Ligand binder design. Structure first.
Ligand SMILES: CCOc1cc(CC(=O)N[C@@H](CC(C)C)c2ccccc2N2CCCCC2)ccc1C(=O)O
Ligand SMILES: Nc1ncnc2c1ncn2[C@@H]1O[C@H](COP(=O)(O)OP(=O)(O)OP(=O)(O)O)[C@@H](O)[C@H]1O
Lengths: 1177, 19
């Protein structure tokens, strides 16, 4: 693209006309040139640090050294955006000067001095100088962005290139986690990018003040010195409000972050909460957090109703100070219209820099902080500079104190080696040091297999799963060969995981997705090492982490056959010593040092063996549903009328300003300008407050409705709709309709209403401007239409690109040692350079579409400058300066009307998402009985009779149960189990009225269970699900939040199950804070909670579900506790997954394929009778 | 900047996977 078209961005016009017909994929906005690559700018930045580190005798990359490196690498493009910025501003100054000339040669009637003695000629050299203000400004806007975006590119790389060299010690990685370094990439790097977006402004704005002082002084005098003083002495109090805002905004963010964790506990555990009638309790727990978040957002709203106010009010008071002082104090050269209507444009220019100068110096401070943060990061610990270890002294402390010394390990090729020892014997540490991740104080680790290192498979003890498909987490960027994959899937039993998944092999696994079971997470990680065909496999306790027992057998039987056939050496540390003297050339270490090394028989001969023997639609419906529904007329009409009346005062302040300059009735000129500008200032306050106030009153009554109509939803909705869908619209859309909409609402409602106002001023000054504006408005309409359609697409394509980049900066940090273990640095390196260049190429075209709008809209506005000038002069020879000082603003109103309109449109779409949630409601609470007199004090008879109940979920073709009849009498503790995919889970949940028994009758305790309120039913019948999680809170509160029974009862209930020793000897006791997920009590504690809920509710019935995978001793203890629970209750209808605990029953119903297969009234005849014994064996 | 999409951004926000 040449200089004729690069300055107007003509190449966008073929990109925005296609973006209207089709949408924009990444294949549409695809190519990214050589100069704007992440790699190229990274090569430039390496050259900068190399040439510095050649030049600098003083070594390290301190904050001084980074800024010298950035300057030497990016100076030649920053000077071209500050030179163009100084010229765009200085040519901008000519615009006020021309207004002065036009009005002087209007009214009361060498050749070049007379050439600029005109008003026809002076408009043309005004018009053909604004085309240079408005093209140089954009050229320097874009060069700043293009250079700024490049720093995003070559700092995210140069951050990531140290993530490839960071040491995973308990010092370094223990201090800074992935959350610290992710907000370096996310939060910090953006505010260093944004410093180079604003880097010319701190150079240019001091020129603007100096010339702004000088030209205003030449136009009006020493009174201009008094006037421009009042702005520059209200710029630091613009800073104080902008400081106190960001102080309060951090508070609001760190407060609603704690809310979102509470909301995550409610949405993730809505299943167990709804069954235990505990949705209302957690609802009122998040609402009080919303009360405290609302008083924090109120302080945000107070300190942002001043920022708008200070921006508008401070210049107007400054202008009135200038003129009234130039009238009251001394009027020598009074306000002739050439002077006054020209120095309004000089202030209307210097409105903008001085109150944006506060927020530049803000973003210079943040840049100083950011290179402090980045240099303190970028001086972290480097890593370093078959396996045979000779001396083997190696530490995690970077000076002294080896955690493993005297390590003389020998592992020649063609091998299979187990490593066993005590929990804490330097065993996991030996493998990571062997891989080359710990500092060899003495010795060496040598190598020659199939200086010079080797790619080695690795399984971490804490398993790591990248956010991808489970197949893709298994394949791990390796060529898919479905025969190797098939063997892996069966061996680790990935078939039940795929079937239980919503998607199977396509399921989003790991983090940010399905938070799988810890054994299931371990099975995924274990399989990747086997699949990868790496030349050596190091497994760090897969068998000690192996949850599935037969698969643990099968793992070893697959790992033997895989190691022997591949002849891939395998070092498998574990302290499960089942295979340990058989055929492993074992290497046992103790207390950090190797204790014995040799063959297995040698360890039989060393007497430690005995120890082993032991898409184009605007949304006016959502905007109407936002304002008129939530806010109410009592402040919707006040906001809509104060906007118009503030915006009729701004023409009335200007219309009377014109009609005084003609006279240049003097104290009446003063007493209406003071009494218009003061009420103009007053209306500024009461529109800036009323906008932000309406935002708070709509944010509250949206979120309160959203919570209290999603805690009124069936659980079938929670299984049908994903919990990421509800939580995203919950969390992110509430942030937009609180923190982002009302400021945009006030800014758009100020700008576009002023835009019509400015085009009203022009059309009455030249009252045949209607002919002039009708063709030009149409072009303004079309650029509006093709910009919204375009820059919505590139907006979400910006935002949905940033998230896979920062998720890569999480997944690199957490599973770091895997990537360095496979010697796999350069293949997660290149995934960054695709992720980086997918973000910059969707941010460059976002800004190039932004600049295309501004170049095109300003040229529309510059046509308004020449036409308003030309038609008004030819009228006024037959209020012209005031009309002409508005035409300059119109070029910079049409921009921001369109810019806010697109942004408001994008933000408005976050209200339609919330109203789509507010139309999803079911699962009524009605009791069609005598609702307090027909139920007695407690239904706890235990007589749960089923009469042909036909129940289902799919509601269309698929029932689960049919024709079922079962009448467990009071005390008939009838543990009913049937076919494993048929109906068992459905049976337990449906009993709590949570599934559609489409016929029949299911009576419980003499009352129909379909004709009771859900709150009454669910409270009065306890349960215990398969393997639930814990709500974070106080221990009595977690056990029973709305208890009101007794504290002694809570102790008796907690002791009666288990863990009373750990409950009493906890550091908290009865108010012990559950540490965010139940990582310190038990799985038994859920049964304890169920026992406490059962006893406190004073019921007899209980429906109890299965148990997933735990200590069977604890499960027999649970079964004995269930017997103890029986020896209080004596009635329980308890399903079970493994039938061997269910063989101690009092009646048994066996269900096959989704029907009743057997109903054995004793449980011992079941062993005699063939169908039931076949399920028993 | 009469319109406010200004350079005072809170950069960090968390959004889970769509659908
Ligand atoms: C991604 C950032 O992209 C930009 C980057 C720039 C460079 C720049 O000085 N920016 C800040 C100024 C600061 C002090 C608030 C700004 C940001 C948003 C809107 C307008 C402005 N002001 C520009 C200076 C004059 C008045 C208004 C311009 C425009 C853009 C843009 O594409 O919108
Ligand atoms: N980065 C590190 N910095 C300092 N100490 C570490 C680090 N990583 C691990 N350790 C310590 O060294 C030990 C290494 O493993 P350990 O000696 O426990 O063998 P293990 O019992 O088989 O491993 P684990 O107990 O973790 O399964 C851990 O107990 C841990 O306390």
């Amino acid at each position: 693209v040449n200089l004729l078209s690069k300055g107007t961005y003509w190449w966008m016009n073929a990109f925005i006309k296609t973006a209207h017909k089709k949408p924009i994929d990444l294949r549409a906005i695809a190519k990214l040139p050589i100069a704007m690559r992440a790699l190229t700018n990274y090569q430039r930045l390496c050259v900068a640090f190399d040439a510095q580190a050649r030049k600098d005798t003083q070594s390290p990359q301190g904050a001084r050294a980074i800024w010298r490196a950035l300057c030497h690498a990016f100076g030649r493009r920053l000077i071209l955006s500050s030179t163009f910025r100084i010229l765009a501003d200085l040519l901008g100054f000519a615009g006020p000067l021309c207004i002065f000339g036009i009005v002087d040669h209007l009214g009361k009637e060498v050749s070049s001095q007379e050439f600029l003695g005109n008003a026809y000629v002076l408009a043309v050299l005004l018009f053909l100088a604004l085309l240079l203000q408005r093209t140089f400004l954009q050229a320097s806007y874009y060069v700043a962005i293009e250079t700024g975006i490049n720093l995003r590119g070559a700092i995210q790389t140069k951050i990531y290139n140290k993530i490839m060299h960071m040491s995973t010690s308990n010092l370094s990685m223990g201090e800074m986690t992935a959350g610290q370094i992710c907000n370096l990439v996310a939060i910090d790097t953006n505010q260093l990018m944004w410093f180079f977006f604003l880097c010319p402004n701190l150079w240019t704005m001091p020129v603007q003040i100096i010339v702004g002082v000088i030209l205003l002084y030449y136009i009006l005098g020493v009174s201009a010195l008094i006037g421009a003083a009042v702005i520059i002495l209200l710029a630091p109090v613009q800073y104080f409000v902008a400081t106190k805002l960001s102080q309060a905004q951090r508070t609001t963010l760190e407060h609603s972050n704690e809310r979102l964790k509470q909301t995550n506990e409610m949405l993730r555990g809505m299943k167990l909460l709804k069954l235990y009638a505990w949705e209302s309790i957690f609802c009122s727990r998040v609402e009080v957090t919303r009360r405290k978040e609302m008083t924090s957002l109120r302080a945000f709203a107070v300190y942002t109703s001043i920022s708008i106010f200070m921006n508008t009010a401070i210049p107007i008071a400054a202008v009135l100070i200038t003129f009234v002082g130039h009238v009251s104090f001394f009027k020598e050269s009074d306000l002739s219209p050439s002077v006054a209507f020209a120095s309004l444009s000089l202030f209307h220019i210097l409105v903008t820099p001085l109150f944006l100068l506060s927020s530049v110096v803000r973003s210079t401070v943040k840049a100083l902080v950011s290179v402090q943060k980045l240099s303190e990061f970028l001086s972290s610990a480097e890593i370093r500079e078959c396996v045979q270890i000779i001396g083997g002294f190696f530490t995690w402390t970077p000076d002294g104190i080896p955690t493993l010394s005297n390590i003389t390990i020998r592992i020649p090729r063609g091998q299979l080696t187990m490593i066993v020892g005590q929990v804490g014997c330097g065993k996991s540490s030996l493998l990571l040091a062997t891989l080359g991740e710990m500092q060899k104080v003495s010795g060496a680790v040598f190598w020659n297999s199939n200086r010079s290192r080797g790619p080695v498979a690795y399984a971490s003890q804490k398993p790591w799963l990248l956010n991808a498909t489970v197949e893709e987490n298994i394949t791990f960027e390796s060529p898919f060969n479905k025969q190797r994959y098939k063997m892996v899937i069966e061996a680790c039993s990935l078939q039940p995981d795929i079937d239980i998944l919503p998607h199977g092999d396509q399921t989003q696994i790991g983090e940010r997705g399905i938070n799988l079971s810890g054994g299931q997470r371990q099975r995924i990680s274990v399989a990747r090492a086997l699949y990868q065909q790496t030349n050596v496999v190091f497994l760090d306790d897969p068998f000690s982490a192996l949850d599935v027992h037969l698969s643990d057998h099968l793992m070893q039987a697959g790992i033997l056959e895989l190691l022997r056939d591949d002849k891939r050496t395998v070092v498998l540390v574990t302290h499960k010593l089942q295979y340990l003297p058989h055929a492993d050339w074992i290497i046992a270490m103790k207390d950090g040092t190797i204790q014995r090394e040799g063959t297995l028989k040698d360890f039989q001969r060393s007497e430690c063996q005995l120890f082993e023997h032991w898409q184009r639609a605007k949304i006016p419906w959502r905007a109407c549903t936002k304002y008129l529904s939530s806010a109410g007329i009592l402040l919707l009409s006040l906001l809509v009328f104060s906007q118009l009346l503030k915006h009729m005062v701004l023409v009335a302040i200007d219309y009377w300003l014109a009609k005084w300059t003609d006279s240049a009735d003097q104290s009446v000129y003063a007493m209406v300008f003071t009494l218009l500008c003061s009420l103009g200032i007053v209306l500024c306050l009461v529109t800036s407050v009323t906008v932000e106030w309406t935002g708070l009153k709509v944010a509250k009554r949206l979120h309160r409705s959203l919570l209290n109509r999603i805690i009124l939803a069936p659980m079938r909705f929670f299984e049908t709709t994903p919990l990421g869908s509800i939580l995203n619209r919950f969390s992110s859309d509430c942030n937009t309709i609180d923190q982002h909409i009302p400021s945009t609402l006030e800014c758009l409602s100020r700008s576009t209403l002023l835009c019509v106002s400015a085009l009203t001023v022009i059309s009455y000054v030249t009252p045949v401007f209607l002919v002039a504006l009708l063709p030009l408005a149409v072009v303004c309409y079309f650029i509006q239409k093709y910009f919204r359609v375009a820059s919505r697409d590139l907006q979400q394509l910006d935002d949905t690109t940033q998230l896979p980049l920062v998720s890569h900066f999480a997944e690199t940090v957490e599973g770091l040692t895997t990537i360095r273990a496979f010697r796999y640095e350069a293949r997660f390196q290149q995934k960054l350079l695709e992720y980086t260049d997918s973000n910059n190429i969707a941010s460059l075209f976002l800004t190039a579409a932004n600049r295309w709008l501004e170049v095109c809209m300003e040229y529309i506005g510059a046509c308004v400058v020449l036409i308003a000038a030309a038609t008004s002069i030819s009228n006024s020879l037959h209020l012209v300066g005031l009309g002409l000082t508005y035409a300059l603003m119109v070029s910079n109103y049409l921009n921001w009307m369109v810019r806010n309109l697109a942004d408001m449109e994008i933000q408005l779409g976050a209200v339609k998402r919330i109203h789509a949630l507010l139309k999803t409601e079911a699962e009524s609470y009605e009791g069609l009985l005598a609702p307090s007199l027909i139920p007695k004090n407690w239904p706890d008879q235990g007589k749960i009779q089923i009469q042909n109940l036909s129940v289902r979920y799919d509601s269309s073709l698929k029932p689960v149960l049919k024709h079922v009849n079962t009448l467990i009498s009071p005390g008939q503790k009838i543990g009913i189990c049937g076919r494993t995919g048929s109906g068992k889970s459905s049976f337990s949940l449906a009993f709590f009225r949570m599934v559609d028994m489409f016929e029949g009758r299911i009576i419980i305790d003499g009352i129909d269970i379909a004709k009771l309120p859900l709150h009454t039913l669910r409270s009065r019948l306890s349960i215990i699900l398969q393997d639930p999680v814990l709500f974070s809170g106080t221990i009595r509160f977690n056990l029973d939040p709305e208890k009101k029974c007794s504290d002694s009862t809570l102790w008796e209930a907690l002791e009666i199950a288990q863990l009373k020793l750990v409950v009493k000897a906890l550091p908290g006791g009865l108010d012990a804070i559950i540490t965010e997920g139940g990582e310190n009590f038990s799985q038994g504690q859920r049964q304890l909670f169920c026992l406490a809920r059962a006893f406190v509710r004073k019921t007899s019935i209980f429906i109890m579900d299965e148990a997933t995978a735990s200590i069977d001793m604890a499960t027999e203890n649970i079964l004995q506790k269930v017997v103890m629970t029986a020896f209080a209750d004596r009635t329980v209808v308890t399903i079970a997954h493994r039938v061997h605990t269910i063989l101690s029953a009092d009646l048994v119903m066996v269900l096959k394929r989704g029907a009743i297969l057997e109903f054995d009234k004793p449980e011992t005849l079941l062993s005699q009778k063939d169908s039931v014994f076949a399920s028993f064996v | 900047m009469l319109s406010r999409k200004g350079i005072i951004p809170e950069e960090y926000v968390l959004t889970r996977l769509a659908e």
